[PDB]
């Protein structure tokens, strides 16, 4: 919980509206599908799928985005015999959470006021693509924020009677 | 307002506790005091001071931090005649807000639960040093966030009866 | 010359192969073309085109990439009466340099050896999309590097006879 | 070799003069010395030291720099029994390379012209602090660059006779 939060505190982050996050899932999934060659026969245990995902993620860009080529190059870091399985399993896992992000519109619609202003909802994620896709695929939680602001004038000294 | 928040969603951002922001002000201010040579005689108008601050900020690093040398080099972009004035005026503006930063402990301490969890307070600022210092010195507002998280299990389909 | 270099030294940068830079031009140009509504009647002087480009660039993401929506939103910062002209002129300017990047394959093919290794050629650009597109569109030069490496063992002390 | 360079093209990078890199080593080392408490008794094997360094690096900021607190917090991720040893071993490894950094002044001083201009030497490292410190401490090589530029006018079509 607070480990996830500290992970976010220790790196450059990015604000996503629910729509923008849904769109990112659509883009990543479509690129990965372009890499599909033959369908898998065997299917990685979740134990081995985790080890392969590690290699895949270490080969992804830490730039803020990834082109199909970047994704396909990262697929190569995956042991060859397991590549097909890894890839179809990755797509299935992403397509399953892809549907789930739509449920954030519920939470994100609840009005909130902070510092006397309506505070909009935004998912909070790593700016780094490798760190971000790792979070979306394997973490149990997704962070988010309610955003507001404090005017500096309201931070000035306003007497001993508060 | 919304203009300020869009500026934040369009770039890599960073989470600051009130303590780490106060510490950042302390670091930037002592570095700038190290660049002080002579005392200013006549000082800049908010018109000319802003023109000079723009040149100063354009010469600052867009990396996440700035060393003394980076700050002193940026000072050189300021017209030589207006430099000592610009510098003393900049230090005074920063020291004034430096005290106001302490007032954020009020707001920050106010309890809040989001998604059934304690939602900690964090100032939200640009990752880029040039962008961050511009906001802290020139803007009338300072953005912040209340942070929380949704577990993916809670985003799964829970049936037709809410 | 060295001003351009210092600008690169003061911010996070990115290495582009000639092919990857060509592909980036193709992506940006196609997105901007999707924003075209009606053809321009008047056409911005280069003086006014520069002022409008400034506004456009200030509204672009400082994240490492931009989606069509990000580009189209930035187009709105452009004075309305001049939007059409700005946009067609921006596309023409990009399409003209797009052809020119192909000439980098000449320079980039010249073999080079640094530290006893073949040193590959890479264009060097801002990680920030707004800073990058500003450079590609309006600077007179494009930076690049020849990359190599020094082994730490070769940096150890090797006697007084060198 | 090429593995190291691909790692560099897949993330935001930063240009360091030999002086600024030497200064970075000085800063990181004095901060780590501030975390020293007791003297280590028994020390880690390169096997166990690397296992501990991994945990240490994962807890470092991916922001471009690290404060003393960031470094000291990262030290806590190291098993408590191996911590004082890990820390003294880390300081010794850094001080050893700190001296080797000075040898880069040889290579760096060697003249070079690229595209008919003096091509300055710069060490090339990750923007992320965690990635940068990992490379400097663990890698057998250090990447560098010779920097230059091509004017767009020189990329225009110059005719069929070369």
CA distance between the termini of chain C: 36
**Is the distance from CB of B58 to CB of B131 less than 8 angstroms?**
no
Other beta carbons less than 10 A from residue C56's beta carbon? 23
CB-nearest to C12 from B60, B63, B126 is B63
**Is the distance from CB of D118 to CB of D111 less than 8 angstroms?**
yes
- Rg, C-alpha atoms of chain C: 20
Rounded-to-integer distance, Cα D124 and Cα D116, Å: 22
- Chain C residue at shortest CA distance from B74: C10
Q: Which residues pair with D116 in a beta bridge?
A: none
The structure tokens listed for C112 are 């080079």
Rounded-to-integer distance, Cα B11 and Cα B123, Å: 15
Residue of D64, D70, D72, D126 for testing the chain B interface, max B β-carbons within 10 Å: D64
User: Helix H segments across A1-156?
Assistant: 2-9, 18-34, 46-58, 68-75, 83-101, 104-107, 129-138
CB-nearest to C10 from B12, B61, B126 is B61
Query: Chain B interface residues facing chain D, Cβ-Cβ under 8 Å?
Result: 14, 20, 23, 63-65, 67, 127
Rounded-to-integer distance, Cα D21 and Cα A38, Å: 48
In B81-97, which positions are buried (b, 16+ CB within 10 angstroms) versus exposed (e)? ebbbbbbbbbbeebeee
Q: Which residue in this structure is represented by tokens 């166990």? A: D48
The structure tokens listed for C12 are 């996070």
Rounded-to-integer distance, Cα A77 and Cα A79, Å: 6
Residue D125 CB burial class (10 angstroms; 0-12, 13-18, ≥19): buried
- Across the B:C interface, residue pairs with CB atoms under 8 Å apart total 32
Which one, of B44, B155, B137, lies nearest residue B91 by Cα? B137
Identify the helix (H) or strand (E) that includes residue D150. strand D141-151
Rounded-to-integer distance, Cα C58 and Cα D90, Å: 43
Query: Chain D interface residues facing chain C, Cβ-Cβ under 8 Å?
Result: 1, 4-5, 8-9, 12-15, 64, 97, 100-101, 103-104, 107, 112, 114-115, 117, 119-120, 122, 124, 127, 139-153, 155-156
Identify the helix (H) or strand (E) that includes residue B3. helix B2-9
To the nearest whole Å, the CA of B41 is away from the closest chain D CA by 35
Which one, of D112, B63, A92, lies nearest residue C119 by Cα? D112
What are the chain C neighbours of B61 within 8 Å (beta carbons)? 10-11
Which parts of chain B are beta strand (E)?
13-16, 113-114, 117-118, 121-126, 141-151
User: Helix H segments across C35-82?
Assistant: 46-58, 68-75
What are the chain A neighbours of B12 within 8 Å (beta carbons)? 12-14, 64, 127
CA distances A150 to A156, B102, B123, C133, Å, are 11, 13, 9, 33
Rounded-to-integer distance, Cα B1 and Cα C38, Å: 32
Q: Is B150 in a helix, a strand, or coil?
A: strand
Rounded-to-integer distance, Cα A141 and Cα A100, Å: 12
Q: Which residue in this structure is represented by tokens 């010359």? A: C1
What are the chain A neighbours of D10 within 8 Å (beta carbons)? 59-63, 70
**Is the distance from CB of D107 to CB of D98 less than 8 angstroms?**
no
What are the chain B neighbours of A151 within 8 Å (beta carbons)? 140-142
Rounded-to-integer distance, Cα D72 and Cα B117, Å: 28
Rounded-to-integer distance, Cα A52 and Cα A87, Å: 10
CA distance between the termini of chain A: 36
Question: Running DSSP on this structure, what letter comes out for residue C76?
Answer: T
Q: Which residue in this structure is represented by tokens 């909802």? A: A121
The residues, any chain, with a CB within 8 Å of residue D139's CB and separated by 6 or more, are C152, D4
**Is the distance from CB of D56 to CB of D42 less than 8 angstroms?**
no
Which one, of A132, A154, A162, lies nearest residue A25 by Cα? A132
Q: Is B68 in a helix, a strand, or coil?
A: helix
Which one, of D84, D91, D83, lies nearest residue D52 by Cα? D83
Rounded-to-integer distance, Cα B54 and Cα B157, Å: 52
Which one, of D88, D84, D81, D73, lies nearest residue D129 by Cα? D73
Q: Is B33 in a helix, a strand, or coil?
A: helix
CB contact under 8 A, B11 and C59: no
| Method by which the coordinates were obtained | X-ray
**Is the distance from CB of B141 to CB of A149 less than 8 angstroms?**
yes
**Is the distance from CB of B16 to CB of B24 less than 8 angstroms?**
yes
Rounded-to-integer distance, Cα B44 and Cα A103, Å: 54
CB-nearest to B150 from A114, A122, A141 is A141
Domain-wise residue ranges, chain B: 12-156
CB contact under 8 A, A63 and C23: no
Q: DSSP letters of C94-148?
A: HHHHHHHHTTHHHHTTS--EETTEE--EEEEEESSHHHHHHHHHH-SEEEEEEEE
What are the chain C neighbours of D147 within 8 Å (beta carbons)? 5, 8, 124, 143-145
Q: Is A139 in a helix, a strand, or coil?
A: coil
The residues, any chain, with a CB within 8 Å of residue A152's CB and separated by 6 or more, are B97, B100, B139, B140, B141, B142
Identify the helix (H) or strand (E) that includes residue C149. strand C141-151
From the options 3.30.70.360, 3.40.50.300, 1.20.272.30, 3.40.50.1370, give the CATH code of D12-156. 1.20.272.30
Cα dihedral D86/D88/D94/D99 (nearest 10): -160
Q: Is B145 in a helix, a strand, or coil?
A: strand
Which one, of A6, A5, A83, lies nearest residue A48 by Cα? A83
Query: Chain D interface residues facing chain A, Cβ-Cβ under 8 Å?
Result: 10-12, 59-63, 70, 126, 128, 131
To the nearest whole Å, the CA of B117 is away from the closest chain C CA by 30
Q: Is C45 in a helix, a strand, or coil?
A: coil
In A117-140, which positions are buried (b, 16+ CB within 10 angstroms) versus exposed (e)? bebbbbbbbbbbbbbbbbbbeeee
List subunits contacting chain C, requiring 3 or more Cβ pairs under 8 Å: A, B, D
In C97-108, which positions are buried (b, 16+ CB within 10 angstroms) versus exposed (e)? ebebbebbeebb
Rounded-to-integer distance, Cα A96 and Cα A101, Å: 9
The residues, any chain, with a CB within 8 Å of residue A78's CB and separated by 6 or more, are A52, A55, A56, A86, A87
Rounded-to-integer distance, Cα D42 and Cα D85, Å: 7
């Amino acid at each position: 919980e607070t480990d996830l939060l500290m992970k976010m505190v220790r790196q450059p982050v990015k604000l996503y509206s629910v729509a923008t996050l849904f769109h990112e899932f659509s883009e990543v999934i479509t690129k990965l599908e372009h890499s599909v060659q033959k369908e898998p026969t065997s299917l990685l245990s979740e134990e081995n799928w985790h080890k392969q995902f590690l290699k895949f993620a270490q080969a992804l860009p830490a730039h803020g985005s990834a082109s199909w080529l970047n994704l396909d190059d990262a697929l190569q870091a995956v042991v060859g015999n397991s590549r097909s399985a890894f890839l179809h399993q990755l797509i299935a896992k992403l397509k399953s959470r892809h549907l789930q992000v739509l449920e954030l519109n519920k939470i994100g619609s609840e009005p909130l006021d902070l510092s006397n202003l309506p505070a909009p909802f935004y998912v909070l994620l790593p700016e780094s693509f490798a760190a971000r896709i790792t979070l979306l695929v394997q973490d149990k939680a997704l962070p988010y924020v309610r955003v507001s602001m404090e005017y500096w004038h309201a931070l000035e000294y306003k007497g001993e009677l508060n």
